[PDB]
Write a protein that holds these residues in place. Structure first.
Motif, PDB file in Angstrom:
ATOM      1  N   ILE A 175      69.579 -15.625  65.960  1.00 14.09           N
ATOM      2  CA  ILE A 175      68.465 -15.370  64.773  1.00 14.09           C
ATOM      3  C   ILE A 175      68.110 -17.689  64.484  1.00 14.09           C
ATOM      4  N   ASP A 176      66.306 -17.056  65.517  1.00 13.06           N
ATOM      5  CA  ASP A 176      66.427 -18.369  64.989  1.00 13.06           C
ATOM      6  C   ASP A 176      65.763 -18.193  62.895  1.00 13.06           C
ATOM      7  N   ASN A 177      66.476 -19.221  62.359  1.00 11.05           N
ATOM      8  CA  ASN A 177      65.862 -19.392  61.118  1.00 11.05           C
ATOM      9  C   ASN A 177      64.528 -18.677  60.610  1.00 11.05           C
ATOM     10  N   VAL A 178      64.060 -18.122  59.009  1.00 11.70           N
ATOM     11  CA  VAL A 178      63.789 -17.957  58.496  1.00 11.70           C
ATOM     12  C   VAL A 178      63.558 -17.366  57.374  1.00 11.70           C
ATOM     13  N   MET A 179      62.759 -17.598  56.610  1.00 11.08           N
ATOM     14  CA  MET A 179      62.899 -17.403  54.930  1.00 11.08           C
ATOM     15  C   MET A 179      62.399 -15.895  54.693  1.00 11.08           C
ATOM     16  N   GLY A 180      63.213 -15.606  53.431  1.00 15.38           N
ATOM     17  CA  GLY A 180      63.099 -14.153  53.229  1.00 15.38           C
ATOM     18  C   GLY A 180      63.314 -13.399  53.616  1.00 15.38           C
ATOM     19  N   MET A 181      63.191 -13.193  55.347  1.00 15.23           N
ATOM     20  CA  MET A 181      63.945 -12.101  55.897  1.00 15.23           C
ATOM     21  C   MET A 181      65.060 -13.148  56.415  1.00 15.23           C
ATOM     22  N   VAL A 182      66.645 -11.947  56.887  1.00 16.63           N
ATOM     23  CA  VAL A 182      67.762 -12.302  57.035  1.00 16.63           C
ATOM     24  C   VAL A 182      68.509 -11.253  57.793  1.00 16.63           C
ATOM     25  N   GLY A 183      69.364 -11.344  58.936  1.00 15.17           N
ATOM     26  CA  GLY A 183      69.870 -11.024  59.897  1.00 15.17           C
ATOM     27  C   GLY A 183      70.853 -10.311  59.313  1.00 15.17           C
ATOM     28  N   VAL A 184      71.567  -8.724  59.884  1.00 17.70           N
ATOM     29  CA  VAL A 184      72.243  -7.609  59.365  1.00 17.70           C
ATOM     30  C   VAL A 184      73.151  -7.728  60.874  1.00 17.70           C
ATOM     31  N   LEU A 185      74.399  -7.943  60.692  1.00 16.26           N
ATOM     32  CA  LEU A 185      75.564  -7.320  61.613  1.00 16.26           C
ATOM     33  C   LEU A 185      76.173  -5.790  61.498  1.00 16.26           C
ATOM     34  N   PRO A 186      76.846  -5.380  62.563  1.00 16.65           N
ATOM     35  CA  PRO A 186      77.556  -4.401  62.040  1.00 16.65           C
ATOM     36  C   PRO A 186      77.483  -3.519  61.364  1.00 16.65           C
ATOM     37  N   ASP A 187      78.667  -4.325  60.456  1.00 21.01           N
ATOM     38  CA  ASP A 187      78.856  -4.144  59.185  1.00 21.01           C
ATOM     39  C   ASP A 187      78.319  -4.278  57.880  1.00 21.01           C
ATOM     40  N   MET A 188      77.084  -4.043  58.047  1.00 18.95           N
ATOM     41  CA  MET A 188      75.800  -4.429  57.019  1.00 18.95           C
ATOM     42  C   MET A 188      76.123  -5.472  56.503  1.00 18.95           C
ATOM     43  N   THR A 189      76.929  -6.592  57.290  1.00 18.48           N
ATOM     44  CA  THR A 189      76.784  -7.619  56.445  1.00 18.48           C
ATOM     45  C   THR A 189      75.680  -8.409  56.593  1.00 18.48           C
ATOM     46  N   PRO A 190      75.205  -9.348  55.550  1.00 22.16           N
ATOM     47  CA  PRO A 190      73.963  -9.967  55.687  1.00 22.16           C
ATOM     48  C   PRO A 190      74.060 -11.832  56.034  1.00 22.16           C
ATOM     49  N   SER A 191      73.544 -12.105  57.555  1.00 19.81           N
ATOM     50  CA  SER A 191      73.323 -13.031  58.139  1.00 19.81           C
ATOM     51  C   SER A 191      72.368 -14.236  58.223  1.00 19.81           C
ATOM     52  N   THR A 192      73.086 -15.503  58.086  1.00 21.66           N
ATOM     53  CA  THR A 192      71.372 -16.391  58.874  1.00 21.66           C
ATOM     54  C   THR A 192      71.822 -16.505  59.971  1.00 21.66           C
ATOM     55  N   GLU A 193      73.242 -16.481  60.481  1.00 20.61           N
ATOM     56  CA  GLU A 193      73.313 -16.746  62.029  1.00 20.61           C
ATOM     57  C   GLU A 193      72.635 -16.093  63.588  1.00 20.61           C
ATOM     58  N   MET A 194      73.375 -14.302  62.557  1.00 21.03           N
ATOM     59  CA  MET A 194      73.276 -13.166  63.974  1.00 21.03           C
ATOM     60  C   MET A 194      72.613 -11.987  63.168  1.00 21.03           C
ATOM     61  N   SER A 195      71.981 -11.269  64.045  1.00 22.17           N
ATOM     62  CA  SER A 195      72.064 -10.044  63.107  1.00 22.17           C
ATOM     63  C   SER A 195      72.004  -9.124  64.821  1.00 22.17           C
ATOM     64  N   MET A 196      71.548  -8.437  64.322  1.00 16.83           N
ATOM     65  CA  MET A 196      71.621  -6.799  65.678  1.00 16.83           C
ATOM     66  C   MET A 196      70.278  -6.917  66.237  1.00 16.83           C
ATOM     67  N   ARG A 197      70.432  -6.581  67.879  1.00 19.24           N
ATOM     68  CA  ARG A 197      69.385  -6.990  68.228  1.00 19.24           C
ATOM     69  C   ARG A 197      68.130  -6.516  67.920  1.00 19.24           C
ATOM     70  N   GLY A 198      67.133  -7.341  67.811  1.00 19.24           N
ATOM     71  CA  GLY A 198      66.128  -7.131  67.012  1.00 19.24           C
ATOM     72  C   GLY A 198      65.484  -6.283  65.679  1.00 19.24           C
ATOM     73  N   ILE A 199      66.838  -6.423  64.774  1.00 16.15           N
ATOM     74  CA  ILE A 199      66.942  -5.924  63.277  1.00 16.15           C
ATOM     75  C   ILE A 199      66.617  -7.107  62.655  1.00 16.15           C
ATOM     76  N   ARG A 200      65.921  -7.240  61.196  1.00 17.64           N
ATOM     77  CA  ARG A 200      65.479  -8.389  60.517  1.00 17.64           C
ATOM     78  C   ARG A 200      65.693  -7.259  58.549  1.00 17.64           C
ATOM     79  N   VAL A 201      66.856  -7.941  57.645  1.00 21.80           N
ATOM     80  CA  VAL A 201      66.307  -7.302  56.887  1.00 21.80           C
ATOM     81  C   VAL A 201      65.642  -8.066  55.516  1.00 21.80           C
ATOM     82  N   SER A 202      64.516  -7.926  55.035  1.00 21.18           N
ATOM     83  CA  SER A 202      63.076  -8.227  54.260  1.00 21.18           C
ATOM     84  C   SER A 202      63.417  -8.179  52.684  1.00 21.18           C
ATOM     85  N   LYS A 203      63.477  -9.453  52.095  1.00 25.17           N
ATOM     86  CA  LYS A 203      63.726  -8.897  50.760  1.00 25.17           C
ATOM     87  C   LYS A 203      62.120  -7.897  50.370  1.00 25.17           C
ATOM     88  N   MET A 204      62.660  -6.921  49.253  1.00 24.34           N
ATOM     89  CA  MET A 204      61.669  -5.942  48.371  1.00 24.34           C
ATOM     90  C   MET A 204      60.896  -6.819  47.295  1.00 24.34           C
TER      91      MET A 204
END
Ligand code: 21G
Length: 158
Positions: free
Chosen positions: A129-158
């Motif tokens: 994932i290209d770095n973005v702020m307030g958007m984070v990647g999420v791994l298959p174990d639901m761990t937040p990550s700045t390096e990688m995410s599940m294909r096309g999935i991004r987690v944004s803060k509420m």
């Protein structure tokens, strides 16, 4: 033009689709007949503990930006999105002993992945994932990550 699926209200933002009754093959090589939607569409998913923006094409998720209460609420929203996308890898993730489908097959697919999303998330794929702020990647174990995410999935803060 709003509907309900897996506890989430779905509203179309942009795009359109036609339906095609089609045969899909599971990871258990079983034949399901699903009503495929053809064309590129954008949706907002509104639930009680999560909200998401869903960008999808025919049997392919393009992007999912999910916001929610905690990991569990967010995972619930990701499961519905991946089942809703009608993707081959979600269908191929239906595998192994007793895992069989009997009347709507989309609701059966959801029940199956609600029970256990491990094969679904791990078989979905991972991307850099290209770095973005307030958007984070999420791994298959639901761990937040700045390096990688599940294909096309991004987690944004509420
Ligand atoms: O096709 C169906 O039978 C139902 C069940 C399974 C998922 C939706 C909610 C229940 C679906 N209903 C609707 N889908 C759609 C719809 C548009 N694009 C889509 N892409 C994938 C998909 F899957 C459903 C849709 N629009 C209006 C609906 F009303």
């Amino acid at each position: 033009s709003s509907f309900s699926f897996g506890g989430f209200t779905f509203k179309r933002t942009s795009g359109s689709s036609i339906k095609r009754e089609e045969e899909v093959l599971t990871g258990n090589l079983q034949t399901l007949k699903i009503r495929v939607h053809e064309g590129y569409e954008e949706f907002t998913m509104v639930g009680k503990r999560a909200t998401a923006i869903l960008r999808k094409a025919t049997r392919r998720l393009v992007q999912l930006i999910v916001s929610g209460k905690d990991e569990q609420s967010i995972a619930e929203a990701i499961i519905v999105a991946m089942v809703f996308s009608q993707e081959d890898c979600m269908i191929k993730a239906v595998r192994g002993d007793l895992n069989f489908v009997n009347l709507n097959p989309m609701h059966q697919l959801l029940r199956h992945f609600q029970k256990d999303a491990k094969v679904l998330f791990q078989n979905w794929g991972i991307e850099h994932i290209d770095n973005v702020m307030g958007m984070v990647g999420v791994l298959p174990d639901m761990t937040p990550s700045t390096e990688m995410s599940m294909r096309g999935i991004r987690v944004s803060k509420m």
